[PDB]
């Protein structure tokens, strides 16, 4: 129901101060409308709940 590029630009983005991350990272897969995230297994759950 939403574009993955917009969501990746909102969750991550310019600089690390804005990012909701510490020392991981989002990537986009446009072919299948998906995000690929690498972070602490505790931040994955809150990110998942918000973007759901």
């Amino acid at each position: 129901f939403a574009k993955a590029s917009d969501i990746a630009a909102m969750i991550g983005g310019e600089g690390n101060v804005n990012m909701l991350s510490e020392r991981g990272s989002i990537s986009i897969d446009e072919r299948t409308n998906s995000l690929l995230i690498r972070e602490l297994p505790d931040n994955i759950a809150v990110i998942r709940e918000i973007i759901e």
Binding site: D29, R31, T32, S34, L36
Partner: protein
């Protein structure tokens, strides 16, 4: 988990236009020219000067 076959979509646009028009005009053109002996009637001054 990423590389999988995707779906295909068929899109069809349709542009329709309809026009109608009506026109009507009526007009009339008439004139008179008469003389009596030292008396005349016309549709201008050059007319009365000509029928002399």
């Amino acid at each position: 988990s990423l590389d999988i076959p995707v779906k295909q979509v068929q899109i069809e646009a349709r542009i329709v236009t309809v026009k109608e028009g009506n026109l009507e005009e009526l007009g009339v053109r008439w004139g008179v020219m008469s003389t009596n002996g030292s008396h005349s009637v016309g549709g201008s001054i050059e007319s009365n000067l000509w029928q002399k």
